[PDB]
Design a protein around this ligand. Structure first.
Ligand SMILES: NC(=O)c1ccc[n+]([C@@H]2O[C@H](COP(=O)([O-])OP(=O)(O)OC[C@H]3O[C@@H](n4cnc5c(N)ncnc54)[C@H](OP(=O)(O)O)[C@@H]3O)[C@@H](O)[C@H]2O)c1
Ligand SMILES: O=C(O)COc1cc(Cl)ccc1C(=O)NCc1ccc(Br)cc1F
Length: 311
């Protein structure tokens, strides 16, 4: 089954194309190729600085009538410097204009932390600590709810929310819409059993990011573990006559997760989509889960300061 039902009643494709680090000079063709070979979900964000180019691709494949708007599932995220009530609508509208869309299928609070508004995405103090905003997640959530009620977004959700923060939203006084999705880091080195079971038990669909361990993350270090090069994962792939990436993408799909591998390489974009015709065994799944080491791609010292830093 290629889509999962969300608690807003809409279906979300379980495979999407990620776009963080996709160069603006390459991402338009990457998205065009992706849609040509089957992808119907694109994961975006304003902070990635490439939504205009992603939007050129979506608009061209709409204009060519390759796909209909209803068949696409486009996701973006509210950056930290826009948590303020009077900045959320405009942030969403900027993303809409850049993506050439009149609505988003899903809009996420990108991180639970609000930062000081301004030109800078990471406003720092002179000692390098992020400068917080006094906004809290519950008031930010109410602002997200407004976007649903104005027709700018079909679904709202959260990203990098820990258990307690998910719970805070669900327990919000006067909660109007539950989050549809929690998008978090998840792969065999960070298997997330606790947060996923919690989210799923509440009917929140979990999207796994960095499913390949983000080998192109700008802060990678030599000593870091490498999923794609792990011989134990390579051996499961070889057994199935698939690539290691293919196994890493199928893994979350069998846990009822949505997964969003990024590539700008046409051959890999296509390879990564060829994951609906094979199954990992229960033993394969448990074996992959055994590799957990609580290793995170996405953590940031400058922000650990903040009252709502999630890890
Ligand atoms: N919500 C958040 O806070 C958050 C955080 C991180 C990521 N995300 C989203 O999740 C997406 C995916 O995560 P990510 O970009 O961190 O990393 P990823 O998808 O785990 O890994 C991307 C890297 O893997 C390479 N790659 C892709 N397919 C491959 C294949 N078949 N074989 C070998 N290498 C392959 C890509 O190379 P090429 O591109 O050169 O082919 C790129 O270097 C992001 O792009 C973003 O949309 C969200
Ligand atoms: O956050 C993403 O989606 C991917 O990571 C980044 C993307 C870009 Cl364009 C810039 C920087 C990051 C980035 O540094 N992400 C890590 C991060 C960020 C904020 C917080 Br509150 C915590 C944290 F771990």
């Amino acid at each position: 089954a290629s889509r999962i039902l969300l608690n807003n009643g809409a279906k979300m494709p379980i495979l999407g194309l990620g776009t963080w680090k996709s160069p603006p000079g390459q991402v338009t063709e990457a998205v065009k190729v992706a849609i040509d070979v089957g992808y119907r979900h694109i994961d975006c964000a304003h902070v990635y600085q490439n939504e205009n180019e992603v939007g050129v691709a979506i608009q061209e494949k709409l204009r060519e009538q390759v796909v209909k708007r209803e068949e696409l599932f486009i996701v973006s995220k509210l950056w930290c410097t826009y948590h303020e009530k009077g900045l959320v609508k405009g942030a969403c509208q900027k993303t809409l204009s850049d993506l050439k869309l009149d609505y988003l299928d899903l809009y996420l609070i990108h991180w639970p932390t609000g930062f000081k508004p301004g030109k800078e995405f990471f406003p720092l103090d002179e000692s390098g600590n992020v400068v917080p905003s006094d906004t809290n997640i519950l008031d930010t959530w109410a602002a997200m709810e407004e976007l649903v009620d104005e027709g700018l977004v079909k679904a709202i959700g959260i990203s990098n929310f820990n258990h307690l923060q998910v719970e805070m939203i669900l327990n919000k006084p006067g909660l109007k819409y539950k989050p549809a999705v929690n998008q978090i880091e998840c792969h065999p080195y960070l298997t997330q059993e606790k947060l996923i079971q919690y989210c799923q038990s509440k009917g929140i669909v979990v999207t796994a990011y960095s499913p390949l361990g983000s080998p192109d993350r700008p802060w990678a270090k030599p000593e870091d573990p490498s999923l794609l090069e792990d011989p134990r994962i390579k051996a499961i792939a070889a057994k199935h006559n698939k690539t290691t990436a293919q196994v890493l993408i199928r893994f979350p799909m069998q846990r009822n997760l949505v997964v969003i591998p990024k590539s700008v390489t046409p051959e890999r974009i296509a390879e990564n989509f060829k994951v609906f015709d094979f199954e990992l065994s229960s033993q394969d799944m448990t074996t992959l889960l055994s590799y957990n080491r609580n290793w995170r791609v996405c953590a940031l010292l400058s922000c650990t300061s903040h009252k709502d830093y999630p890890f």
